[PDB]
């Protein structure tokens, strides 16, 4: 016989039980009332006893066991273990099977960009997981959406070039413009693209360096409102940021008035007020189709426009949802 | 044979023992004296030994077991387990049975809107469970009770519309009016309608954001007395409130004198002093029937009325309970 031990600590433990449940174990009853309110309750049923399965003509024997003495502290439950056991020659099938199961599990599970935050000189989770912001969803000027999504895509591929030269492998960015132009939305959409986690930090200088040094894995630092500052300490800690991998640090400011040297900020781009392209693309995002109205909106917004910003468009477009005709006369007056 | 393990940790453990007690286990003696005072005492009787039952001609065998070594910390008792065991072919009946039992349990158990509150930068329970406030019980102006119970009912159904556009899935409300108009009563009745929990918070700005971010599941935030304020920090934290689901934030003020932009407050309605419809509906709520007196009250309250409010009506209606004739002359003078 052969063995394959998957212990209850591994992340591929719940995945495998989910797979074997659906093979032709948690059981969760879930009642939705007349309201959207939900009454749901889950119960497990993985017997300390062995079962059988037939995957591709194998007759795999599976046991699941609990320890009568040991207690896990990660989940507060005794230590469990699933043991597959089959024909000896085809033990190598097990990995294949689990890989398939893992893939079918990972296809459904879509991530969510956790946001860490500062809690003194230590990063704590904050704001139980958000949802992916879906880069097509953010609409900014014509060329800026691609001028950055390819600089980063090169910076994620130039490890050898930066390593062999002996310079640190990091990069900064400076999104600057008027308040309400869609900077933060774009940063979150980009982090969702690379499924990293935004360790947000808004502006003490001595612990700022500790915060810079101690970032979780697969993160994208964000520095809000850099025009509010300790400056020498800021430059010192910003130059002394290191990692085993990329260290991206976006920076947003409402008015950016030495810092522009490489190693520090080196890609500066100006996201500003709305353009006749941005308004058209937002109008087509809200109202699929209906091309005729778009122009009838644009030539209307060509007049009485001073600080027309995309937050204003979002507000004046959500209040007249599923009704462009109301928007035609409402937004034109604001 | 088959098995079905329900362990003592699951919420469907007490439910099942309650069901099997009433099948044709806690035993609680309960003595009410001549006073309303109560002497009550409960004792359990679930033997570590197996029993039998006949549900629909099945002869189900049930064991209940205690662990001689392990101690649960949630209830301070050893770890218990109920094991049903019957004919092998009809193992699938067990789930059906438990579902029926759960439903018959949930029909009787009526919830109670727990109120969380602020304890520094962390939400603690407060005020051991209240009772449902029963929306018909709160009486406000003619159209305002439905103009909000349908906006929310749409906002609970527009997840895809708000998600696909890439905007956060939250919404604010601004109930404004004179003190004593019945705002808080309506908010509690509405939360009881959606069986959520009011994480009440009355007005420090840095921890307000932490409080906003960390809300329990299935909650409805409430911000009392917003006309008392850090303002820029208020707007900043209010725009940076996120969740995995809806984030409703009602706001009450006694005198509401930039905030009205969508994403922030977007549904404003004015609940004010008493109307000749409100007084009639309160009078009919207190005194079922007796239509003749209603008009004889209304034309009486048409005179000498300045700041007639529903709290005043509640006070002057409860002091003459089961006696409208006393109210006719008492309330008319206040």
PDB file of N, CA, C and O in Angstrom, chain B residues 234-303:
ATOM      1  N   UNK B 234     -14.055  63.763  10.031  1.00  0.00           N
ATOM      2  CA  UNK B 234     -15.333  63.082   9.895  1.00  0.00           C
ATOM      3  C   UNK B 234     -15.589  62.688   8.453  1.00  0.00           C
ATOM      4  O   UNK B 234     -15.916  61.534   8.163  1.00  0.00           O
ATOM      5  N   UNK B 235     -15.416  63.631   7.530  1.00  0.00           N
ATOM      6  CA  UNK B 235     -15.638  63.314   6.127  1.00  0.00           C
ATOM      7  C   UNK B 235     -14.643  62.282   5.628  1.00  0.00           C
ATOM      8  O   UNK B 235     -15.002  61.380   4.862  1.00  0.00           O
ATOM      9  N   UNK B 236     -13.395  62.375   6.082  1.00  0.00           N
ATOM     10  CA  UNK B 236     -12.374  61.432   5.646  1.00  0.00           C
ATOM     11  C   UNK B 236     -12.695  60.019   6.100  1.00  0.00           C
ATOM     12  O   UNK B 236     -12.665  59.076   5.301  1.00  0.00           O
ATOM     13  N   UNK B 237     -13.016  59.850   7.379  1.00  0.00           N
ATOM     14  CA  UNK B 237     -13.344  58.519   7.856  1.00  0.00           C
ATOM     15  C   UNK B 237     -14.659  58.027   7.283  1.00  0.00           C
ATOM     16  O   UNK B 237     -14.803  56.832   7.017  1.00  0.00           O
ATOM     17  N   UNK B 238     -15.609  58.928   7.047  1.00  0.00           N
ATOM     18  CA  UNK B 238     -16.886  58.510   6.496  1.00  0.00           C
ATOM     19  C   UNK B 238     -16.755  58.054   5.055  1.00  0.00           C
ATOM     20  O   UNK B 238     -17.467  57.141   4.630  1.00  0.00           O
ATOM     21  N   UNK B 239     -15.863  58.670   4.287  1.00  0.00           N
ATOM     22  CA  UNK B 239     -15.621  58.173   2.943  1.00  0.00           C
ATOM     23  C   UNK B 239     -14.771  56.914   2.925  1.00  0.00           C
ATOM     24  O   UNK B 239     -14.796  56.182   1.931  1.00  0.00           O
ATOM     25  N   UNK B 240     -14.045  56.630   4.001  1.00  0.00           N
ATOM     26  CA  UNK B 240     -13.192  55.462   4.018  1.00  0.00           C
ATOM     27  C   UNK B 240     -13.784  54.349   4.850  1.00  0.00           C
ATOM     28  O   UNK B 240     -13.065  53.616   5.532  1.00  0.00           O
ATOM     29  N   UNK B 241     -15.098  54.192   4.771  1.00  0.00           N
ATOM     30  CA  UNK B 241     -15.796  53.102   5.432  1.00  0.00           C
ATOM     31  C   UNK B 241     -16.059  52.037   4.386  1.00  0.00           C
ATOM     32  O   UNK B 241     -16.528  52.336   3.282  1.00  0.00           O
ATOM     33  N   UNK B 242     -15.709  50.802   4.704  1.00  0.00           N
ATOM     34  CA  UNK B 242     -15.825  49.734   3.734  1.00  0.00           C
ATOM     35  C   UNK B 242     -16.323  48.491   4.445  1.00  0.00           C
ATOM     36  O   UNK B 242     -16.319  48.406   5.675  1.00  0.00           O
ATOM     37  N   UNK B 243     -16.737  47.513   3.655  1.00  0.00           N
ATOM     38  CA  UNK B 243     -17.149  46.224   4.189  1.00  0.00           C
ATOM     39  C   UNK B 243     -17.211  45.242   3.036  1.00  0.00           C
ATOM     40  O   UNK B 243     -16.932  45.583   1.882  1.00  0.00           O
ATOM     41  N   UNK B 244     -17.632  44.026   3.351  1.00  0.00           N
ATOM     42  CA  UNK B 244     -17.832  43.014   2.334  1.00  0.00           C
ATOM     43  C   UNK B 244     -19.261  43.038   1.836  1.00  0.00           C
ATOM     44  O   UNK B 244     -19.606  42.287   0.917  1.00  0.00           O
ATOM     45  N   UNK B 245     -20.087  43.892   2.428  1.00  0.00           N
ATOM     46  CA  UNK B 245     -21.501  43.973   2.123  1.00  0.00           C
ATOM     47  C   UNK B 245     -21.947  45.416   2.312  1.00  0.00           C
ATOM     48  O   UNK B 245     -21.129  46.342   2.320  1.00  0.00           O
ATOM     49  N   UNK B 246     -23.251  45.589   2.476  1.00  0.00           N
ATOM     50  CA  UNK B 246     -23.850  46.883   2.749  1.00  0.00           C
ATOM     51  C   UNK B 246     -23.227  47.547   3.969  1.00  0.00           C
ATOM     52  O   UNK B 246     -22.802  46.887   4.921  1.00  0.00           O
ATOM     53  N   UNK B 247     -23.157  48.876   3.919  1.00  0.00           N
ATOM     54  CA  UNK B 247     -22.720  49.698   5.048  1.00  0.00           C
ATOM     55  C   UNK B 247     -23.695  50.873   5.114  1.00  0.00           C
ATOM     56  O   UNK B 247     -23.450  51.927   4.523  1.00  0.00           O
ATOM     57  N   UNK B 248     -24.786  50.690   5.825  1.00  0.00           N
ATOM     58  CA  UNK B 248     -25.769  51.747   6.014  1.00  0.00           C
ATOM     59  C   UNK B 248     -25.360  52.596   7.201  1.00  0.00           C
ATOM     60  O   UNK B 248     -24.901  52.073   8.220  1.00  0.00           O
ATOM     61  N   UNK B 249     -25.535  53.914   7.088  1.00  0.00           N
ATOM     62  CA  UNK B 249     -25.180  54.827   8.178  1.00  0.00           C
ATOM     63  C   UNK B 249     -26.258  55.897   8.286  1.00  0.00           C
ATOM     64  O   UNK B 249     -26.189  56.926   7.611  1.00  0.00           O
ATOM     65  N   UNK B 250     -27.234  55.669   9.153  1.00  0.00           N
ATOM     66  CA  UNK B 250     -28.222  56.702   9.398  1.00  0.00           C
ATOM     67  C   UNK B 250     -27.591  57.841  10.177  1.00  0.00           C
ATOM     68  O   UNK B 250     -26.638  57.649  10.932  1.00  0.00           O
ATOM     69  N   UNK B 251     -28.134  59.037  10.001  1.00  0.00           N
ATOM     70  CA  UNK B 251     -27.641  60.182  10.747  1.00  0.00           C
ATOM     71  C   UNK B 251     -28.805  61.038  11.207  1.00  0.00           C
ATOM     72  O   UNK B 251     -29.656  61.424  10.403  1.00  0.00           O
ATOM     73  N   UNK B 252     -28.837  61.325  12.500  1.00  0.00           N
ATOM     74  CA  UNK B 252     -29.870  62.144  13.104  1.00  0.00           C
ATOM     75  C   UNK B 252     -29.283  63.443  13.626  1.00  0.00           C
ATOM     76  O   UNK B 252     -28.192  63.451  14.200  1.00  0.00           O
ATOM     77  N   UNK B 253     -29.999  64.540  13.410  1.00  0.00           N
ATOM     78  CA  UNK B 253     -29.583  65.836  13.920  1.00  0.00           C
ATOM     79  C   UNK B 253     -30.808  66.641  14.312  1.00  0.00           C
ATOM     80  O   UNK B 253     -31.896  66.457  13.763  1.00  0.00           O
ATOM     81  N   UNK B 254     -30.621  67.525  15.284  1.00  0.00           N
ATOM     82  CA  UNK B 254     -31.714  68.359  15.755  1.00  0.00           C
ATOM     83  C   UNK B 254     -31.875  69.620  14.926  1.00  0.00           C
ATOM     84  O   UNK B 254     -32.982  70.158  14.827  1.00  0.00           O
ATOM     85  N   UNK B 255     -30.792  70.097  14.339  1.00  0.00           N
ATOM     86  CA  UNK B 255     -30.774  71.232  13.433  1.00  0.00           C
ATOM     87  C   UNK B 255     -29.597  71.073  12.483  1.00  0.00           C
ATOM     88  O   UNK B 255     -28.441  71.251  12.883  1.00  0.00           O
ATOM     89  N   UNK B 256     -29.848  70.758  11.225  1.00  0.00           N
ATOM     90  CA  UNK B 256     -28.762  70.486  10.270  1.00  0.00           C
ATOM     91  C   UNK B 256     -28.185  71.749   9.642  1.00  0.00           C
ATOM     92  O   UNK B 256     -28.230  71.957   8.429  1.00  0.00           O
ATOM     93  N   UNK B 257     -27.641  72.614  10.486  1.00  0.00           N
ATOM     94  CA  UNK B 257     -26.945  73.796  10.008  1.00  0.00           C
ATOM     95  C   UNK B 257     -25.732  74.099  10.876  1.00  0.00           C
ATOM     96  O   UNK B 257     -24.716  73.412  10.793  1.00  0.00           O
ATOM     97  N   UNK B 258     -22.041  70.381   1.124  1.00  0.00           N
ATOM     98  CA  UNK B 258     -20.793  69.650   0.949  1.00  0.00           C
ATOM     99  C   UNK B 258     -20.946  68.220   1.437  1.00  0.00           C
ATOM    100  O   UNK B 258     -20.417  67.281   0.845  1.00  0.00           O
ATOM    101  N   UNK B 259     -21.695  68.067   2.525  1.00  0.00           N
ATOM    102  CA  UNK B 259     -21.913  66.749   3.099  1.00  0.00           C
ATOM    103  C   UNK B 259     -22.905  65.960   2.262  1.00  0.00           C
ATOM    104  O   UNK B 259     -22.868  64.724   2.239  1.00  0.00           O
ATOM    105  N   UNK B 260     -23.781  66.655   1.548  1.00  0.00           N
ATOM    106  CA  UNK B 260     -24.888  66.069   0.805  1.00  0.00           C
ATOM    107  C   UNK B 260     -24.466  65.355  -0.468  1.00  0.00           C
ATOM    108  O   UNK B 260     -25.336  64.869  -1.196  1.00  0.00           O
ATOM    109  N   UNK B 261     -23.182  65.288  -0.766  1.00  0.00           N
ATOM    110  CA  UNK B 261     -22.752  64.593  -1.963  1.00  0.00           C
ATOM    111  C   UNK B 261     -22.990  63.090  -1.823  1.00  0.00           C
ATOM    112  O   UNK B 261     -22.830  62.528  -0.736  1.00  0.00           O
ATOM    113  N   UNK B 262     -23.365  62.419  -2.910  1.00  0.00           N
ATOM    114  CA  UNK B 262     -23.512  60.960  -2.893  1.00  0.00           C
ATOM    115  C   UNK B 262     -22.219  60.244  -2.542  1.00  0.00           C
ATOM    116  O   UNK B 262     -21.121  60.785  -2.668  1.00  0.00           O
ATOM    117  N   UNK B 263     -22.372  59.013  -2.063  1.00  0.00           N
ATOM    118  CA  UNK B 263     -21.315  58.302  -1.361  1.00  0.00           C
ATOM    119  C   UNK B 263     -21.319  58.646   0.102  1.00  0.00           C
ATOM    120  O   UNK B 263     -21.187  57.775   0.964  1.00  0.00           O
ATOM    121  N   UNK B 264     -21.487  59.917   0.390  1.00  0.00           N
ATOM    122  CA  UNK B 264     -21.909  60.374   1.699  1.00  0.00           C
ATOM    123  C   UNK B 264     -23.437  60.409   1.723  1.00  0.00           C
ATOM    124  O   UNK B 264     -24.096  59.708   0.950  1.00  0.00           O
ATOM    125  N   UNK B 265     -24.008  61.182   2.639  1.00  0.00           N
ATOM    126  CA  UNK B 265     -25.447  61.373   2.770  1.00  0.00           C
ATOM    127  C   UNK B 265     -26.111  61.603   1.423  1.00  0.00           C
ATOM    128  O   UNK B 265     -25.741  62.524   0.688  1.00  0.00           O
ATOM    129  N   UNK B 266     -27.099  60.773   1.088  1.00  0.00           N
ATOM    130  CA  UNK B 266     -27.777  60.919  -0.192  1.00  0.00           C
ATOM    131  C   UNK B 266     -29.288  60.778  -0.128  1.00  0.00           C
ATOM    132  O   UNK B 266     -29.941  61.028  -1.143  1.00  0.00           O
ATOM    133  N   UNK B 267     -29.870  60.382   0.996  1.00  0.00           N
ATOM    134  CA  UNK B 267     -31.320  60.348   1.161  1.00  0.00           C
ATOM    135  C   UNK B 267     -31.634  61.171   2.402  1.00  0.00           C
ATOM    136  O   UNK B 267     -31.489  60.685   3.527  1.00  0.00           O
ATOM    137  N   UNK B 268     -32.082  62.404   2.207  1.00  0.00           N
ATOM    138  CA  UNK B 268     -32.458  63.283   3.304  1.00  0.00           C
ATOM    139  C   UNK B 268     -33.966  63.447   3.362  1.00  0.00           C
ATOM    140  O   UNK B 268     -34.600  63.742   2.345  1.00  0.00           O
ATOM    141  N   UNK B 269     -34.540  63.246   4.546  1.00  0.00           N
ATOM    142  CA  UNK B 269     -35.967  63.437   4.763  1.00  0.00           C
ATOM    143  C   UNK B 269     -36.175  64.053   6.136  1.00  0.00           C
ATOM    144  O   UNK B 269     -35.402  63.823   7.070  1.00  0.00           O
ATOM    145  N   UNK B 270     -37.227  64.850   6.242  1.00  0.00           N
ATOM    146  CA  UNK B 270     -37.494  65.689   7.404  1.00  0.00           C
ATOM    147  C   UNK B 270     -38.659  65.104   8.190  1.00  0.00           C
ATOM    148  O   UNK B 270     -39.816  65.221   7.783  1.00  0.00           O
ATOM    149  N   UNK B 271     -38.349  64.476   9.316  1.00  0.00           N
ATOM    150  CA  UNK B 271     -39.350  64.064  10.289  1.00  0.00           C
ATOM    151  C   UNK B 271     -39.453  65.148  11.351  1.00  0.00           C
ATOM    152  O   UNK B 271     -38.482  65.431  12.061  1.00  0.00           O
ATOM    153  N   UNK B 272     -40.632  65.749  11.459  1.00  0.00           N
ATOM    154  CA  UNK B 272     -40.854  66.929  12.261  1.00  0.00           C
ATOM    155  C   UNK B 272     -41.968  66.711  13.266  1.00  0.00           C
ATOM    156  O   UNK B 272     -42.176  65.609  13.773  1.00  0.00           O
ATOM    157  N   UNK B 273     -42.694  67.789  13.544  1.00  0.00           N
ATOM    158  CA  UNK B 273     -43.715  67.762  14.576  1.00  0.00           C
ATOM    159  C   UNK B 273     -44.927  66.952  14.119  1.00  0.00           C
ATOM    160  O   UNK B 273     -44.985  66.420  13.008  1.00  0.00           O
ATOM    161  N   UNK B 274     -45.906  66.859  15.012  1.00  0.00           N
ATOM    162  CA  UNK B 274     -47.066  66.006  14.803  1.00  0.00           C
ATOM    163  C   UNK B 274     -47.986  66.568  13.728  1.00  0.00           C
ATOM    164  O   UNK B 274     -48.141  67.783  13.588  1.00  0.00           O
ATOM    165  N   UNK B 275     -48.588  65.673  12.962  1.00  0.00           N
ATOM    166  CA  UNK B 275     -49.568  66.048  11.964  1.00  0.00           C
ATOM    167  C   UNK B 275     -50.937  65.539  12.372  1.00  0.00           C
ATOM    168  O   UNK B 275     -51.054  64.575  13.138  1.00  0.00           O
ATOM    169  N   UNK B 276     -52.004  66.159  11.874  1.00  0.00           N
ATOM    170  CA  UNK B 276     -53.348  65.647  12.168  1.00  0.00           C
ATOM    171  C   UNK B 276     -53.555  64.210  11.736  1.00  0.00           C
ATOM    172  O   UNK B 276     -54.489  63.561  12.221  1.00  0.00           O
ATOM    173  N   UNK B 277     -52.703  63.684  10.864  1.00  0.00           N
ATOM    174  CA  UNK B 277     -52.726  62.257  10.579  1.00  0.00           C
ATOM    175  C   UNK B 277     -51.993  61.457  11.646  1.00  0.00           C
ATOM    176  O   UNK B 277     -52.462  60.390  12.061  1.00  0.00           O
ATOM    177  N   UNK B 278     -50.855  61.969  12.111  1.00  0.00           N
ATOM    178  CA  UNK B 278     -50.099  61.268  13.140  1.00  0.00           C
ATOM    179  C   UNK B 278     -50.885  61.173  14.436  1.00  0.00           C
ATOM    180  O   UNK B 278     -50.896  60.121  15.087  1.00  0.00           O
ATOM    181  N   UNK B 279     -51.562  62.253  14.822  1.00  0.00           N
ATOM    182  CA  UNK B 279     -52.319  62.231  16.067  1.00  0.00           C
ATOM    183  C   UNK B 279     -53.475  61.247  15.971  1.00  0.00           C
ATOM    184  O   UNK B 279     -53.747  60.493  16.913  1.00  0.00           O
ATOM    185  N   UNK B 280     -54.137  61.204  14.818  1.00  0.00           N
ATOM    186  CA  UNK B 280     -55.215  60.249  14.619  1.00  0.00           C
ATOM    187  C   UNK B 280     -54.712  58.817  14.683  1.00  0.00           C
ATOM    188  O   UNK B 280     -55.335  57.956  15.317  1.00  0.00           O
ATOM    189  N   UNK B 281     -53.564  58.552  14.069  1.00  0.00           N
ATOM    190  CA  UNK B 281     -53.075  57.184  14.048  1.00  0.00           C
ATOM    191  C   UNK B 281     -52.573  56.745  15.415  1.00  0.00           C
ATOM    192  O   UNK B 281     -52.781  55.595  15.811  1.00  0.00           O
ATOM    193  N   UNK B 282     -51.976  57.659  16.176  1.00  0.00           N
ATOM    194  CA  UNK B 282     -51.584  57.332  17.541  1.00  0.00           C
ATOM    195  C   UNK B 282     -52.803  57.070  18.407  1.00  0.00           C
ATOM    196  O   UNK B 282     -52.831  56.109  19.188  1.00  0.00           O
ATOM    197  N   UNK B 283     -53.824  57.916  18.272  1.00  0.00           N
ATOM    198  CA  UNK B 283     -55.047  57.739  19.039  1.00  0.00           C
ATOM    199  C   UNK B 283     -55.706  56.407  18.722  1.00  0.00           C
ATOM    200  O   UNK B 283     -56.250  55.748  19.615  1.00  0.00           O
ATOM    201  N   UNK B 284     -55.658  55.984  17.462  1.00  0.00           N
ATOM    202  CA  UNK B 284     -56.222  54.683  17.146  1.00  0.00           C
ATOM    203  C   UNK B 284     -55.300  53.542  17.549  1.00  0.00           C
ATOM    204  O   UNK B 284     -55.777  52.420  17.745  1.00  0.00           O
ATOM    205  N   UNK B 285     -54.006  53.808  17.719  1.00  0.00           N
ATOM    206  CA  UNK B 285     -53.114  52.757  18.192  1.00  0.00           C
ATOM    207  C   UNK B 285     -53.360  52.489  19.662  1.00  0.00           C
ATOM    208  O   UNK B 285     -53.390  51.335  20.101  1.00  0.00           O
ATOM    209  N   UNK B 286     -53.555  53.554  20.431  1.00  0.00           N
ATOM    210  CA  UNK B 286     -53.765  53.410  21.863  1.00  0.00           C
ATOM    211  C   UNK B 286     -55.124  52.799  22.146  1.00  0.00           C
ATOM    212  O   UNK B 286     -55.243  51.851  22.931  1.00  0.00           O
ATOM    213  N   UNK B 287     -56.159  53.318  21.504  1.00  0.00           N
ATOM    214  CA  UNK B 287     -57.532  52.936  21.795  1.00  0.00           C
ATOM    215  C   UNK B 287     -58.081  52.301  20.532  1.00  0.00           C
ATOM    216  O   UNK B 287     -58.476  53.003  19.596  1.00  0.00           O
ATOM    217  N   UNK B 288     -58.088  50.974  20.503  1.00  0.00           N
ATOM    218  CA  UNK B 288     -58.626  50.289  19.344  1.00  0.00           C
ATOM    219  C   UNK B 288     -60.110  50.602  19.234  1.00  0.00           C
ATOM    220  O   UNK B 288     -60.812  50.715  20.243  1.00  0.00           O
ATOM    221  N   UNK B 289     -60.586  50.763  18.005  1.00  0.00           N
ATOM    222  CA  UNK B 289     -61.961  51.185  17.902  1.00  0.00           C
ATOM    223  C   UNK B 289     -62.154  52.622  18.356  1.00  0.00           C
ATOM    224  O   UNK B 289     -61.228  53.436  18.408  1.00  0.00           O
ATOM    225  N   UNK B 290     -63.405  52.915  18.703  1.00  0.00           N
ATOM    226  CA  UNK B 290     -63.800  54.198  19.271  1.00  0.00           C
ATOM    227  C   UNK B 290     -63.443  55.334  18.320  1.00  0.00           C
ATOM    228  O   UNK B 290     -62.649  56.227  18.627  1.00  0.00           O
ATOM    229  N   UNK B 291     -64.079  55.294  17.152  1.00  0.00           N
ATOM    230  CA  UNK B 291     -63.725  56.258  16.127  1.00  0.00           C
ATOM    231  C   UNK B 291     -64.245  57.624  16.511  1.00  0.00           C
ATOM    232  O   UNK B 291     -63.596  58.638  16.240  1.00  0.00           O
ATOM    233  N   UNK B 292     -65.386  57.654  17.195  1.00  0.00           N
ATOM    234  CA  UNK B 292     -66.053  58.912  17.485  1.00  0.00           C
ATOM    235  C   UNK B 292     -65.139  59.832  18.277  1.00  0.00           C
ATOM    236  O   UNK B 292     -65.063  61.033  18.005  1.00  0.00           O
ATOM    237  N   UNK B 293     -64.417  59.277  19.247  1.00  0.00           N
ATOM    238  CA  UNK B 293     -63.562  60.105  20.080  1.00  0.00           C
ATOM    239  C   UNK B 293     -62.421  60.706  19.285  1.00  0.00           C
ATOM    240  O   UNK B 293     -61.887  61.750  19.665  1.00  0.00           O
ATOM    241  N   UNK B 294     -61.972  60.040  18.224  1.00  0.00           N
ATOM    242  CA  UNK B 294     -60.775  60.506  17.535  1.00  0.00           C
ATOM    243  C   UNK B 294     -60.961  61.933  17.042  1.00  0.00           C
ATOM    244  O   UNK B 294     -60.177  62.830  17.369  1.00  0.00           O
ATOM    245  N   UNK B 295     -62.005  62.149  16.240  1.00  0.00           N
ATOM    246  CA  UNK B 295     -62.314  63.486  15.758  1.00  0.00           C
ATOM    247  C   UNK B 295     -62.521  64.455  16.911  1.00  0.00           C
ATOM    248  O   UNK B 295     -62.045  65.599  16.871  1.00  0.00           O
ATOM    249  N   UNK B 296     -63.224  64.010  17.957  1.00  0.00           N
ATOM    250  CA  UNK B 296     -63.450  64.878  19.102  1.00  0.00           C
ATOM    251  C   UNK B 296     -62.147  65.239  19.789  1.00  0.00           C
ATOM    252  O   UNK B 296     -62.101  66.212  20.548  1.00  0.00           O
ATOM    253  N   UNK B 297     -61.091  64.477  19.532  1.00  0.00           N
ATOM    254  CA  UNK B 297     -59.774  64.841  20.020  1.00  0.00           C
ATOM    255  C   UNK B 297     -59.070  65.769  19.054  1.00  0.00           C
ATOM    256  O   UNK B 297     -58.420  66.729  19.473  1.00  0.00           O
ATOM    257  N   UNK B 298     -59.184  65.480  17.761  1.00  0.00           N
ATOM    258  CA  UNK B 298     -58.389  66.199  16.773  1.00  0.00           C
ATOM    259  C   UNK B 298     -58.811  67.660  16.736  1.00  0.00           C
ATOM    260  O   UNK B 298     -57.983  68.569  16.851  1.00  0.00           O
ATOM    261  N   UNK B 299     -60.118  67.907  16.608  1.00  0.00           N
ATOM    262  CA  UNK B 299     -60.594  69.284  16.625  1.00  0.00           C
ATOM    263  C   UNK B 299     -60.310  69.964  17.950  1.00  0.00           C
ATOM    264  O   UNK B 299     -60.277  71.197  18.008  1.00  0.00           O
ATOM    265  N   UNK B 300     -60.083  69.192  19.008  1.00  0.00           N
ATOM    266  CA  UNK B 300     -59.685  69.806  20.264  1.00  0.00           C
ATOM    267  C   UNK B 300     -58.219  70.202  20.241  1.00  0.00           C
ATOM    268  O   UNK B 300     -57.846  71.249  20.777  1.00  0.00           O
ATOM    269  N   UNK B 301     -57.378  69.391  19.594  1.00  0.00           N
ATOM    270  CA  UNK B 301     -55.953  69.679  19.551  1.00  0.00           C
ATOM    271  C   UNK B 301     -55.612  70.624  18.419  1.00  0.00           C
ATOM    272  O   UNK B 301     -54.448  71.026  18.287  1.00  0.00           O
ATOM    273  N   UNK B 302     -56.595  71.009  17.606  1.00  0.00           N
ATOM    274  CA  UNK B 302     -56.348  71.988  16.561  1.00  0.00           C
ATOM    275  C   UNK B 302     -56.001  73.342  17.146  1.00  0.00           C
ATOM    276  O   UNK B 302     -55.349  74.151  16.479  1.00  0.00           O
ATOM    277  N   UNK B 303     -56.421  73.599  18.376  1.00  0.00           N
ATOM    278  CA  UNK B 303     -56.158  74.849  19.060  1.00  0.00           C
ATOM    279  C   UNK B 303     -55.142  74.601  20.162  1.00  0.00           C
ATOM    280  O   UNK B 303     -55.044  73.492  20.696  1.00  0.00           O
TER     281      UNK B 303
END
